[PDB]
Amino acid sequence: KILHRLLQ
Amino acid sequence: KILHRLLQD
Amino acid sequence: LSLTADQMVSALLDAEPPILYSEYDPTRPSEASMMGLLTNLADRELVHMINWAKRVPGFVDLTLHDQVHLLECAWLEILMIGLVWRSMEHPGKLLFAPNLLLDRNQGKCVEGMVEIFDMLLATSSRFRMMNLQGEEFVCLKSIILLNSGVYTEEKDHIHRVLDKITDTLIHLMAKAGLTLQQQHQRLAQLLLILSHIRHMSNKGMEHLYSMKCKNLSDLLLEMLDA
Amino acid sequence: LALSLTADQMVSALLDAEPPILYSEFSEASMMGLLTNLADRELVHMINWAKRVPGFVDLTLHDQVHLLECAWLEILMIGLVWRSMEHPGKLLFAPNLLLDRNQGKCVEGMVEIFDMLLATSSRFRMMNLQGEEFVCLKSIILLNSGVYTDHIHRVLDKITDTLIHLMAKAGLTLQQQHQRLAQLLLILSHIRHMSNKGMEHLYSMKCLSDLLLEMLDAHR
Ligand SMILES: O=S1C(c2ccc(O)cc2F)=CC=C1c1ccc(O)cc1F
Ligand SMILES: O=S1C(c2ccc(O)cc2F)=CC=C1c1ccc(O)cc1F
Numbered sequence: 001k002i003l004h005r006l007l008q
Numbered sequence: 009k010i011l012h013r014l015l016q017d
Numbered sequence: 018l019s020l021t022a023d024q025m026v027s028a029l030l031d032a033e034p035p036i037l038y039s040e041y042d043p044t045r046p047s048e049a050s051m052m053g054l055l056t057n058l059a060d061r062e063l064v065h066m067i068n069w070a071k072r073v074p075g076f077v078d079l080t081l082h083d084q085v086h087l088l089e090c091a092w093l094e095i096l097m098i099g100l101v102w103r104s105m106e107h108p109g110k111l112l113f114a115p116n117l118l119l120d121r122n123q124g125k126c127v128e129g130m131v132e133i134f135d136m137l138l139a140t141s142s143r144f145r146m147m148n149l150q151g152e153e154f155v156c157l158k159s160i161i162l163l164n165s166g167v168y169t170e171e172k173d174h175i176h177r178v179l180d181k182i183t184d185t186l187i188h189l190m191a192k193a194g195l196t197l198q199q200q201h202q203r204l205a206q207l208l209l210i211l212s213h214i215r216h217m218s219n220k221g222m223e224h225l226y227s228m229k230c231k232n233l234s235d236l237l238l239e240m241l242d243a
Numbered sequence: 244l245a246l247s248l249t250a251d252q253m254v255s256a257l258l259d260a261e262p263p264i265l266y267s268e269f270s271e272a273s274m275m276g277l278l279t280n281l282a283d284r285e286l287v288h289m290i291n292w293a294k295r296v297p298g299f300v301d302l303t304l305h306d307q308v309h310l311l312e313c314a315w316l317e318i319l320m321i322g323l324v325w326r327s328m329e330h331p332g333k334l335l336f337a338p339n340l341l342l343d344r345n346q347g348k349c350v351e352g353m354v355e356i357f358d359m360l361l362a363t364s365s366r367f368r369m370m371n372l373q374g375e376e377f378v379c380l381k382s383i384i385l386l387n388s389g390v391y392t393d394h395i396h397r398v399l400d401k402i403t404d405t406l407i408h409l410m411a412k413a414g415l416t417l418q419q420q421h422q423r424l425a426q427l428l429l430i431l432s433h434i435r436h437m438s439n440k441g442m443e444h445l446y447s448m449k450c451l452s453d454l455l456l457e458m459l460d461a462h463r
Contacts, residue, residue, distance in 0.1 A: 007307055007311075136392065140391070205399070209431070212432045219436065223443070
């Protein structure tokens, strides 16, 4: 998930 | 316009 | 414009629509019938809702075009918050009618209906946790009617009435022994729920318009094409 | 951690966490391209802004994702509406991209959303919303919109305290504080409405960056 990476 | 009729009644 | 907060509440409570019964037959099983039960029920309530709206303070002062507009926008929201309210004392269940109590498993009988069911249940659980009062409920429901379609001279009149309902809500909370901080917080919590009710309605309109193409009463079709 | 903050500490935290105003790069395809490109770049900043929102970091990774997936379009819209306050009848998507309703007719079904967005801006203009109130509303959207599908509610109560505190500084009476609070929160109901209408209109256009496609398929 792209959203997972950006949140981390 | 059923809604209009019921509102006028 | 001139009514005590106590006078506002008593007027709304007296204007409350009755709880209608379904044509649900326990001898019967289907997806088509179960949908037909809800839509038929959601057709007979509308007649009562229309007459209920006329008794909402400030609604009669609006033009016919404005009355039609507010109802076309908020009719499903008003139905939903009523359902949610009736289902407060029935955890994990939706009380569409005294003879029609459904859970999320029975909502699986119709495709895509389980999502709307869970949101309605969560909303009912919210009112239960907050211990929503009937006086607060009739205020919220009248707010929905006047607010949902106000943006989409008579504008600030509605806002003035809406401001009066806000004062009424605060007046109720103050009588319950809530502090000023608690009054503001509870007022905020109740109004944030309206955002969720709007969301459920929008999804409800989608699923309902989808069913129309699949192939509902004539009055319900007027609301859909609106 | 965020519950120990003061009302002024909450405001200053939100203000300093504000994302930047990005710039944009005629026809329907070109106009749709500019908006979605701008929206995608803006999403990256929104995510970093979210982590700076008091209490949001205390949430699990799964819950953070859910809240963002649910409210991302709402957050974009209220930001657009906020930027367009000093431009009546116009929507300031970017400093070099100011559009009116007739330009919204370039895309089919876009004019309806344009009218609603314009109406919200004039509403904010009529009230007239303050920046301190704006950042509170936007953070409320992030935490509330997906709270259904104890901590978040306590943080929500704190933002309410902050909103009331701000209105008390402005010299508003107790009655005016209740009413203005209610007026602001009822607007969120329509921001939700615009988002849902904009959501289905965007899904039809899809049938876009992979990030946008992740956000869209989350609501599908
Ligand atoms: O009839 S419905 C309904 C309802 C009906 C009667 C009522 O009193 C309250 C309600 F909330 C909530 C969701 C309904 C629904 C019904 C059919 C459909 O395709 C989509 C829907 F959301
Ligand atoms: O991208 S959008 C948008 C927006 C974009 C970037 C931005 O920074 C702020 C925004 F509000 C408001 C409405 C949009 C929208 C965009 C595409 C579409 O098909 C439908 C829509 F409603």
